[PDB]
Amino acid sequence: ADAHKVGLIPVTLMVSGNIMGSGVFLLPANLASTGGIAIYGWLVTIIGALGLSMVYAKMSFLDPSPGGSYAYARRCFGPFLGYQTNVLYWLACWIGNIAMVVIGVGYLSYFFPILKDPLVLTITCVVVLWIFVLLNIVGPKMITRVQAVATVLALIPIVGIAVFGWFWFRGETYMAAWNVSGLGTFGAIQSTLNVTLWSFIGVESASVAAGVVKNPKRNVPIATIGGVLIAAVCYVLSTTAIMGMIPNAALRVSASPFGDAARMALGDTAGAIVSFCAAAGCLGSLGGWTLLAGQTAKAAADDGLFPPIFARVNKAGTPVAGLIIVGILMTIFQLSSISPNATKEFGLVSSVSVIFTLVPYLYTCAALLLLGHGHFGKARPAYLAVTTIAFLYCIWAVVGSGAKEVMWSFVTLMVITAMYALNYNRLHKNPYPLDAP
Amino acid sequence: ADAHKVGLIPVTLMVSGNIMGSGVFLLPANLASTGGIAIYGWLVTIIGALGLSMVYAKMSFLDPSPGGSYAYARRCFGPFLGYQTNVLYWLACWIGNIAMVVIGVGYLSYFFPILKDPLVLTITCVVVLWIFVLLNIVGPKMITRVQAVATVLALIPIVGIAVFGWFWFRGETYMAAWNVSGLGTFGAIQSTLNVTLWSFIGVESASVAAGVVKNPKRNVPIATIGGVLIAAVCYVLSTTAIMGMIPNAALRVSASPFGDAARMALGDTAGAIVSFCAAAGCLGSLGGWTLLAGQTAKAAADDGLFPPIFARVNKAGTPVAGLIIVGILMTIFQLSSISPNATKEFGLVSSVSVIFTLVPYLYTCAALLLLGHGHFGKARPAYLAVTTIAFLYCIWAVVGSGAKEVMWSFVTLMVITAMYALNYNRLHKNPYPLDAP
């Protein structure tokens, strides 16, 4: 916990930055099709999210192992589900970076419109991806410092509106569009949840990165809960404020409602600032998620549950080869941005890989109960209550997702089972083996 | 103990009877929207299905444990996946019985058309379900003897056509409808697989019933492979024969095309004989699937991985309380046949519970490799190849299913994980526990 370890502040900002990412600037537009009643959804979401964060906070307290969810799963269920957890989470991590870099450079197209030409966009995206791979190769202190700065920058317009927009906030504007979904109350709330439940992916960030965090038993829980709280407060305040500052129709039509509304309100410099800050958030988030990919792959390979090259490190302990591999894969999938059709072809892959993350969450909740029951004391009813909420959080997220995406997630589980069996027979140790031949 | 065990012939007819079931008399009508090219789909399916049956034969040879797949999954993956396997398979067993009894009683409405009134149909179904529950309480020797007779009766119109229909078979008829799907060759085959891959559910029957089979190390592998071969040969010969005897247009439209083709070819008694035999097939299958439900639940409860009541037995070792609980559950869901709308609602459930079975298949495949590698010798490549083909059968079945049904299957996995964790924490043994509190 000295030289190559990351301090509390950069880790906390990595959690909140990984969570807020691209999404925070786009949330009001997505929620505007439902209306102000979305506040109820937020209320439901945050209680769930906090629950999940607490689950991680306690689990990482009990076991600050590198790789987080993976390790926990491995502890309570064994090598097969550890293997599965890592495959799913690793894939989610680097596949999710494509959309993020596309959105991020997209924000930068405010200054340089050539970035909307799909070819230049693709080249630029590949270059930026490799920039953050290289920053990750320099080391975790470097990447978390870069993301810390990026996250503060991204927080500038969010906190700005979330504090000072209230002078322009009109309750009549907010309530004029309380429910424009056409649905009853539960339906409207559900259509809200279909957006907001996915807003807290990244809660697991500090847990997974526990191996490079200074004093992780103390700092990982703090960073987890703190990052989630920062995200929640920003989410609510900013979306509510904007819903009270801008008429619902305009909010619905806008593709960048902080930026379009900023550019119109305080001038073009405002739009430039919001665009720059949004781009900063996205690009820093790239660094964070790449770090997480490297870490999970490294822990799994360290246990012989992922190819050994993912555990090959330099003198600093950085998984350089694994990061380069992730770079190559991301580069290959990034080619989808060369055309609208190519982009939409890739879209269902992204949507599926986002669902991948929920299995690590589920196993983390289960791991908390199965591994840590002897640490609960007479606060056991509370733990059960919180973890159950966290369980519900995950399940509901899937319940509201598109059927096709979940179908292909299921297929992915099956393929992973087949892969484990075909690659690890003779190596795998059985809980209840057959007698000797 | 040997006195309440079932011999080779009845177990083999239980496998082939559980496989053929309701399906066999409806296949030609289902395949007629594709056409004669379905033979290509049969060839692919039968290679996959034989592969899966070889896997079950070899695994049960190495470990003829009660509960089949449940036991193998617990061995190679531990209590959690054992628990999951049983819940899934148990549910699939008794939930699937609802559609089967409706179809079976449906056939009997050829004689008694009052059975087509939804109210009389539901009462009758409830009564018939309790009959086969009560026969199971008499014992496995009684239920497999009843099913053996029923299966042989059900085979009379099937084998009759598959041997003697060829006198009326015409290639011009068959080839006039070679491909009426409107799709290309791969697509036509795929539309065939969407039907035929689900035609071999029940391959696991002898394996799951190993605890009531005489000399199971010998007889389960024979009955498993033997039963599948009987189904495969019957499926192919009879669907092919009918597609060459009856014009595609008429075949596409028939609700009972062995019955419609028979009743009009050799007279009204012919339609009576086919109706009675098809009803026998369905009802016998009710008995066997109910037996399997009792066996899997008992095997899990014996290991403390299902409620204790499911392991309470009479002097003969029959899980009487377990059978009664399944009777009650079946009765509650059987209420869905009182109305068309009531039946449509229940339909998704049946559709979902059918996918459940493939997870046990998948774990059985993994278990063979994981547990049994040391028994392969240098015949190892053959085992890897066959098991890989069995893996592909399972994945392919799912890839071709409706998205919504697979989604709710995924959700069910999540709920089960949450249930395991909330029910078995403090009892569950962790592979890598934390240190002492």
UniProtKB/Swiss-Prot annotation, chains A, B:
A motif (Helix-breaking GVESA motif TM6) lies at residues 202-206. Optimum pH is 5.5 or less for Arg-Agm exchange, which slows dramatically as pH rises and is almost undetectable at pH 7.0 and higher. It is found in: Cell inner membrane. A motif (Helix-breaking GSG motif TM1) lies at residues 21-23. One of its GO terms (cellular component) is plasma membrane. GO terms for molecular function: antiporter activity; identical protein binding. Changing residue 333 to A: Severely decreased antiport. It comes from the Bacteria. InterPro entries: AA/rel_permease1, APC_superfamily. It is a multi-pass membrane protein. Residues 1-8, 58-82, 139, 204-222, 298-319, 367-384, 423-437 are cytoplasmic. Keywords: Amino-acid transport, Antiport, Cell inner membrane, Cell membrane, Membrane, Transmembrane, Transmembrane helix, Transport. The record marks 89, 204, 361 as: Cytoplasmic (distal) gate. The record marks 198 as: Periplasmic (proximal) gate. Major component of the acid-resistance (AR) system allowing enteric pathogens to survive the acidic environment in the stomach. Exchanges extracellular arginine for its intracellular decarboxylation product agmatine (Agm) thereby expelling intracellular protons. Probably undergoes several conformational states in order to translocate the substrate across the membrane; keeps the substrate accessible to only 1 side of the membrane at a time by opening and closing 3 membrane-internal gates. Belongs to the amino acid-polyamine-organocation (APC) superfamily. Basic amino acid/polyamine antiporter (APA) (TC 2.A.3.2) family. PANTHER family: AMINO ACID TRANSPORTER-RELATED, ARGININE_AGMATINE ANTIPORTER. This is Arginine/agmatine antiporter. It comes from Escherichia coli O157:H7.
